Design an enzyme around this catalytic site. Structure first.
Site, PDB file in Angstrom:
ATOM      1  N   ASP A   1       0.744  -1.251   0.000  1.00 52.35           N
ATOM      2  CA  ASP A   1       0.000   0.000   0.000  1.00 52.35           C
ATOM      3  C   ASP A   1       0.770   1.295   0.000  1.00 52.35           C
ATOM      4  O   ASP A   1       0.208   2.345   0.300  1.00 52.35           O
ATOM      5  CB  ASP A   1      -1.033  -0.006   1.116  1.00 52.35           C
ATOM      6  CG  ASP A   1      -2.041  -1.092   0.932  1.00 52.35           C
ATOM      7  OD1 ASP A   1      -2.641  -1.126  -0.157  1.00 52.35           O
ATOM      8  OD2 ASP A   1      -2.207  -1.922   1.843  1.00 52.35           O
TER       9      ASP A   1
ATOM     10  N   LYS B   1       2.755   2.012  -5.340  1.00 53.41           N
ATOM     11  CA  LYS B   1       3.634   1.567  -6.400  1.00 53.41           C
ATOM     12  C   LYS B   1       3.152   1.834  -7.823  1.00 53.41           C
ATOM     13  O   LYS B   1       3.934   2.223  -8.687  1.00 53.41           O
ATOM     14  CB  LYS B   1       3.968   0.094  -6.172  1.00 53.41           C
ATOM     15  CG  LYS B   1       4.612  -0.149  -4.815  1.00 53.41           C
ATOM     16  CD  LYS B   1       4.948  -1.588  -4.588  1.00 53.41           C
ATOM     17  CE  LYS B   1       3.719  -2.380  -4.291  1.00 53.41           C
ATOM     18  NZ  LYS B   1       3.173  -2.081  -2.950  1.00 53.41           N
TER      19      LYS B   1
ATOM     20  N   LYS C   1       1.351   4.299  -9.284  1.00 56.32           N
ATOM     21  CA  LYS C   1       1.590   5.622  -9.815  1.00 56.32           C
ATOM     22  C   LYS C   1       3.018   5.814 -10.282  1.00 56.32           C
ATOM     23  O   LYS C   1       3.252   6.368 -11.347  1.00 56.32           O
ATOM     24  CB  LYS C   1       1.271   6.706  -8.793  1.00 56.32           C
ATOM     25  CG  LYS C   1       1.854   8.047  -9.220  1.00 56.32           C
ATOM     26  CD  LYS C   1       1.651   9.203  -8.285  1.00 56.32           C
ATOM     27  CE  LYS C   1       2.422  10.381  -8.877  1.00 56.32           C
ATOM     28  NZ  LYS C   1       2.244  11.650  -8.136  1.00 56.32           N
TER      29      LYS C   1
ATOM     30  N   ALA D   1      -2.796  -7.328  -6.854  1.00 61.10           N
ATOM     31  CA  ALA D   1      -1.959  -6.182  -6.698  1.00 61.10           C
ATOM     32  C   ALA D   1      -2.626  -4.927  -6.217  1.00 61.10           C
ATOM     33  O   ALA D   1      -2.123  -4.278  -5.313  1.00 61.10           O
ATOM     34  CB  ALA D   1      -1.205  -5.885  -7.949  1.00 61.10           C
ATOM     35  N   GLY D   2      -3.675  -4.490  -6.907  1.00 54.47           N
ATOM     36  CA  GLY D   2      -4.376  -3.277  -6.501  1.00 54.47           C
ATOM     37  C   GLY D   2      -3.530  -2.043  -6.691  1.00 54.47           C
ATOM     38  O   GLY D   2      -3.303  -1.303  -5.747  1.00 54.47           O
ATOM     39  N   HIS D   3      -3.028  -1.860  -7.908  1.00 58.84           N
ATOM     40  CA  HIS D   3      -2.211  -0.706  -8.275  1.00 58.84           C
ATOM     41  C   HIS D   3      -3.108   0.327  -8.961  1.00 58.84           C
ATOM     42  O   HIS D   3      -3.615   0.098 -10.065  1.00 58.84           O
ATOM     43  CB  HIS D   3      -1.061  -1.136  -9.177  1.00 58.84           C
ATOM     44  CG  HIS D   3       0.072  -1.791  -8.435  1.00 58.84           C
ATOM     45  ND1 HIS D   3       1.199  -2.284  -9.060  1.00 58.84           N
ATOM     46  CD2 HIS D   3       0.258  -2.015  -7.106  1.00 58.84           C
ATOM     47  CE1 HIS D   3       2.029  -2.782  -8.155  1.00 58.84           C
ATOM     48  NE2 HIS D   3       1.480  -2.627  -6.963  1.00 58.84           N
TER      49      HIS D   3
ATOM     50  N   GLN E   1       2.642  -6.174  -3.424  1.00 57.60           N
ATOM     51  CA  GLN E   1       2.792  -6.382  -1.965  1.00 57.60           C
ATOM     52  C   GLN E   1       3.933  -5.520  -1.394  1.00 57.60           C
ATOM     53  O   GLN E   1       4.070  -4.374  -1.794  1.00 57.60           O
ATOM     54  CB  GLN E   1       2.975  -7.851  -1.607  1.00 57.60           C
ATOM     55  CG  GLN E   1       1.714  -8.677  -1.759  1.00 57.60           C
ATOM     56  CD  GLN E   1       1.423  -9.104  -3.184  1.00 57.60           C
ATOM     57  OE1 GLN E   1       2.236  -9.748  -3.830  1.00 57.60           O
ATOM     58  NE2 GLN E   1       0.248  -8.789  -3.660  1.00 57.60           N
TER      59      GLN E   1
ATOM     60  N   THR F   1     -14.740  -6.163   3.219  1.00 59.23           N
ATOM     61  CA  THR F   1     -14.723  -6.576   4.611  1.00 59.23           C
ATOM     62  C   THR F   1     -13.369  -7.142   4.966  1.00 59.23           C
ATOM     63  O   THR F   1     -12.829  -7.982   4.249  1.00 59.23           O
ATOM     64  CB  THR F   1     -15.792  -7.655   4.827  1.00 59.23           C
ATOM     65  OG1 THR F   1     -16.935  -7.346   4.020  1.00 59.23           O
ATOM     66  CG2 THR F   1     -16.200  -7.736   6.295  1.00 59.23           C
TER      67      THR F   1
ATOM     68  N   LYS G   1       2.414  10.103  -0.026  1.00 53.23           N
ATOM     69  CA  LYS G   1       1.495  10.558   0.986  1.00 53.23           C
ATOM     70  C   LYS G   1       2.013  11.339   2.171  1.00 53.23           C
ATOM     71  O   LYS G   1       1.563  11.105   3.296  1.00 53.23           O
ATOM     72  CB  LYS G   1       0.674   9.399   1.465  1.00 53.23           C
ATOM     73  CG  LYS G   1      -0.184   8.902   0.400  1.00 53.23           C
ATOM     74  CD  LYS G   1      -0.827   7.660   0.866  1.00 53.23           C
ATOM     75  CE  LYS G   1      -2.303   7.715   0.642  1.00 53.23           C
ATOM     76  NZ  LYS G   1      -2.850   6.465   1.202  1.00 53.23           N
TER      77      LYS G   1
ATOM     78  N   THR H   1       3.396  14.120  -4.145  1.00 48.81           N
ATOM     79  CA  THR H   1       2.587  15.059  -3.380  1.00 48.81           C
ATOM     80  C   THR H   1       1.113  15.001  -3.750  1.00 48.81           C
ATOM     81  O   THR H   1       0.314  15.793  -3.265  1.00 48.81           O
ATOM     82  CB  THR H   1       3.097  16.498  -3.578  1.00 48.81           C
ATOM     83  OG1 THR H   1       2.939  16.882  -4.951  1.00 48.81           O
ATOM     84  CG2 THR H   1       4.570  16.603  -3.210  1.00 48.81           C
TER      85      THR H   1
HETATM   86  N1  LIG Z   1      -1.897  -5.956  -2.473  1.00 46.23           N
HETATM   87  C1  LIG Z   1      -1.681  -6.215  -1.150  1.00 46.23           C
HETATM   88  N2  LIG Z   1      -1.488  -5.246  -0.250  1.00 46.23           N
HETATM   89  C2  LIG Z   1      -1.301  -5.543   1.029  1.00 46.23           C
HETATM   90  N3  LIG Z   1      -1.133  -6.723   1.604  1.00 46.23           N
HETATM   91  C3  LIG Z   1      -1.425  -7.660   0.704  1.00 46.23           C
HETATM   92  C4  LIG Z   1      -1.713  -7.496  -0.628  1.00 46.23           C
HETATM   93  N4  LIG Z   1      -2.061  -8.681  -1.191  1.00 46.23           N
HETATM   94  C5  LIG Z   1      -1.744  -9.508  -0.238  1.00 46.23           C
HETATM   95  N5  LIG Z   1      -1.485  -8.961   0.951  1.00 46.23           N
HETATM   96  C6  LIG Z   1      -1.414  -9.557   2.274  1.00 46.23           C
HETATM   97  O1  LIG Z   1      -0.686 -10.776   2.251  1.00 46.23           O
HETATM   98  C7  LIG Z   1      -1.259 -11.731   3.160  1.00 46.23           C
HETATM   99  C8  LIG Z   1      -1.629 -12.991   2.394  1.00 46.23           C
HETATM  100  O2  LIG Z   1      -2.301 -12.682   1.207  1.00 46.23           O
HETATM  101  P1  LIG Z   1      -2.342 -13.619  -0.032  1.00 46.23           P
HETATM  102  O3  LIG Z   1      -1.417 -12.983  -0.995  1.00 46.23           O
HETATM  103  O4  LIG Z   1      -3.752 -13.478  -0.466  1.00 46.23           O
HETATM  104  O5  LIG Z   1      -2.073 -14.970   0.456  1.00 46.23           O
HETATM  105  C9  LIG Z   1      -2.387 -10.942   3.865  1.00 46.23           C
HETATM  106  O6  LIG Z   1      -1.728 -10.248   4.954  1.00 46.23           O
HETATM  107  C10 LIG Z   1      -2.742  -9.982   2.765  1.00 46.23           C
HETATM  108  O7  LIG Z   1      -3.377  -8.846   3.241  1.00 46.23           O
END
Ligand SMILES: Nc1ncnc2c1ncn2[C@@H]1O[C@H](COP(=O)(O)O)[C@@H](O)[C@H]1O
Ligand SMILES: Nc1ncnc2c1ncn2[C@@H]1O[C@H](COP(=O)(O)O)[C@@H](O)[C@H]1O
Lengths: 431, 431
Positions: free
Chosen positions: B13, B16, B18, B39-41, B224, B301, B331, B415
């Protein structure tokens, strides 16, 4: 050269142990970064021969400290037995061995599962060394396995052990219809050894960051070989850890920008143990010869080594995966006397395509035929030769050709199994 | 700077996406080397926001080619859906995306197993993203899993699939007492997508070796973050792949000697999602504030992010594991207005010891208390600031202190969420 990695360029059996010992004359540290107690690194010092599976090959040297990095799946039993042998011989193993608390632990149910899966694979069996290596790594990426650090809390240890064995014994007994594994046995066995392990724990990443600052020389010792790498090898006929130079960072914690030189140990001919593709495998009198003069008989049943000509297409793949800096040719002497020696320079595809790049998955290696380059052999002995001048012109040309096709120089030539029988054209530490 | 790696310094988080987009203005290639479709980029370009999970973040740029390396456990379904969204928006995804035939395939039974294991862990649950990532990697090191290449032979594919699902459905139904997974469903679903996948296959190791020779610029995009690395993270509250810079070699095939610069993305405060140690976690109004101004609510959730002060002891560990070259602060604006900002400079052990090094296993992180350094905050806005001069002296001192404690310079300061709102003090490509 401050940080030098030593790995096998092929499918293992290239002679990594000798080169590590030899070069650690100057190293402060030697670090294992992958694999388990399945290395089989032979050391022949002034006549005496040592075979090490787990403990690093810098253990006989007085000035060096050996470490087992976090990538190594560790077995307390194997470690104990290897420690005993070496102490019996007079090697003060306890004063120069350190380990990482992040090392996964291999235990009985692992070997048990290893045998089980192999027996079950039937004709598509891999050819596992049988030491439970694959299952241990499997537990780790699934975050259910134990680690040396888990041994700090005897109480919690028991709880975890119990939850793990419960799951495994289920698949054993119920799915593999095999013997369950005794919890109390494992538990007691581990507790007994438990205190020798923890006494040796150290923070490897931090220690290696420090060595980097002090400017100490560090030697990393890979086991197996490039084409047995879980990611880039001939999957699934492959080992479960990364054998390539990238495993140095991942398995010891040293930043990737700090690897200074990568030495690829290159056997003068090819070998493989276990199942799997092998384009240049020999089935004739030459295959027979290489096996016999090479002394490729092995450890036990199924551990007799397959032989073949040097595969320059596969070695070239090893060059890119590891960003090799130089090679160390071993066993040129086995080729002594042959009329003509050959070497694969390209692959003929099922459909007639000629390529210079190896296929990825075993299934694609299926119908490849090697395209060789033949050249004259040499009649004189090269065994024990300590100076380049003493090498026959035909032997020198074979060497020259490997350098041309791969783009990498041959920096050391091993002409015998003893530390003394070697030609160091360029010291990796001085590069 | 020819080969630049971009990874997260913390627990993810850090922002990455941007930075990848921003910098790929000059890159010919962007390569994902680990993780899955988790990933969630986020990309905010002139107002429009894109969120990518699998496809690399260089996909919106016209001159760049995106590749998914062999380390990425790939899902045909997720890939298809993400391809559709981007094509709908007008992005010609098919003309600039390539993948490796060595990518393991994630399929239904994997997500099924993921849910199963989590549900079963009960209170010691990890906090998995639920995408079946961990089980897919597990199959791979056990050499039983499928890969994109397996899709070349529709016939053999079925056979393998059948042997795998048989084993998994057993543990599901019989051990987890959970629903079995329909073989024909999976089979048909995969066959449908099967031809879009193979049409995009490429030999990544070879392609990257070529780029290295042509002198092309390559950007690797980690997902990650460092402390979630399977080897060096806070195991078992960790992900199943190596998130550290060593995973670049292992997961794309580029030799370790070719990584030229490693950029560590550093969020100005800390976050974590899921279970696991977190020394500097905040439970008060400040914790509340950081979450709200940071917009750390999450995906769903359990996906609401935990917050805390910047942990300089943990960041320092990230520095050594990755041989970081520079940081990219993201940030800083969230801290705007606070009376005083803090930062952990050492850890107080249960027994009173003060250390500057992070513990290894989660259990050892148990009773650590952070030792902070407090400093004045700043009242003016730093959001959108494009020039250093516009930063309040108090904000500059916070920056200066991070540089002093870690030893690494902050080369870029973000920024704002838009590509334009950034201060590049040193281009990694020009270093
Ligand atoms: N994009 C991500 N950002 C933050 N933590 C992550 C992310 N994807 C996986 N994790 C964390 O990695 C652990 C295991 O996730 P997983 O990759 O689903 O097995 C948990 O703590 C997840 O929240
Ligand atoms: N020291 C070694 N030398 C050669 N191949 C090895 C070695 N140890 C493991 N392998 C091979 O790696 C495969 C799997 O072995 P394992 O590491 O036992 O799972 C088989 O092909 C083994 O022969």
């Amino acid at each position: 050269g401050n940080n030098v990695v030593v790995l096998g360029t092929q499918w293992g059996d290239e002679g990594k142990g000798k080169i590590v010992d030899l070069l650690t004359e100057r190293a402060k540290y030697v670090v294992r970064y992958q694999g388990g107690h399945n290395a089989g690194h032979t050391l022949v010092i002034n006549g005496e021969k040592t075979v090490l599976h787990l403990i690093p090959s810098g253990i006989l040297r007085e000035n060096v400290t050996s470490i087992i990095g976090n990538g190594v799946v560790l077995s307390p039993a194997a470690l104990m037995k290897e420690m005993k042998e070496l102490e019996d011989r007079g090697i003060p193993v306890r004063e120069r061995l350190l380990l990482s608390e992040a090392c996964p632990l291999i235990l009985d149910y692992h070997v048990a599962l290893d045998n089980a899966r192999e027996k079950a694979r039937g004709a598509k069996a891999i050819g596992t060394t049988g030491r439970g290596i694959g299952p241990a790594y499997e537990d780790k990426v699934a975050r259910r396995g134990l680690r040396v650090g888990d041994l700090f809390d005897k109480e919690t240890f028991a709880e975890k052990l119990k939850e793990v064995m419960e799951y495994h014994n289920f698949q054993l007994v119920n799915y593999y219809k095999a013997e369950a594994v005794d919890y109390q046995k494992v538990l007691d066995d581990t507790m007994a050894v438990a205190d020798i392990l923890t006494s040796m724990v150290v923070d490897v990443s931090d220690l290696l960051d420090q060595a980097r600052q002090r400017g100490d020389f560090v030697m990393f010792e890979g086991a197996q070989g490039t084409l047995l790498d879980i990611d880039h090898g001939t999957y699934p006929y492959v080992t479960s850890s990364n054998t390539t130079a990238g495993g140095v960072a991942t398995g010891s914690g040293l930043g990737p920008r700090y690897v200074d030189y990568v030495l690829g140990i290159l056997k003068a001919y090819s070998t493989r143990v276990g199942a799997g593709p092998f384009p240049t495998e020999l089935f004739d009198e030459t295959g027979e010869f290489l096996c016999k003069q090479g002394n490729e008989f092995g450890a036990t049943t199924g551990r007799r080594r397959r032989t073949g000509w040097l595969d320059t297409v596969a070695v070239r793949r090893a060059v890119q995966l590891n960003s090799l800096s130089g090679f160390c040719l071993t066993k040129l002497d086995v080729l002594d006397g042959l009329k003509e020696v050959k070497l694969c320079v390209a692959y003929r595809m099922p459909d007639g395509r000629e390529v210079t790049t190896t296929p990825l998955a075993a299934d694609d290696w299926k119908g490849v035929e090697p395209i060789y380059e033949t050249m004259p052999g040499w009649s004189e002995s090269t065994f024990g030769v300590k100076d380049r001048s003493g090498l026959p012109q035909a032997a020198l040309n074979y060497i020259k050709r490997i350098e041309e096709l791969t783009g990498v120089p041959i920096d050391i030539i091993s002409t015998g199994p003893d530390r003394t029988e070697t030609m160091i054209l360029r010291d990796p530490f001085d590069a």
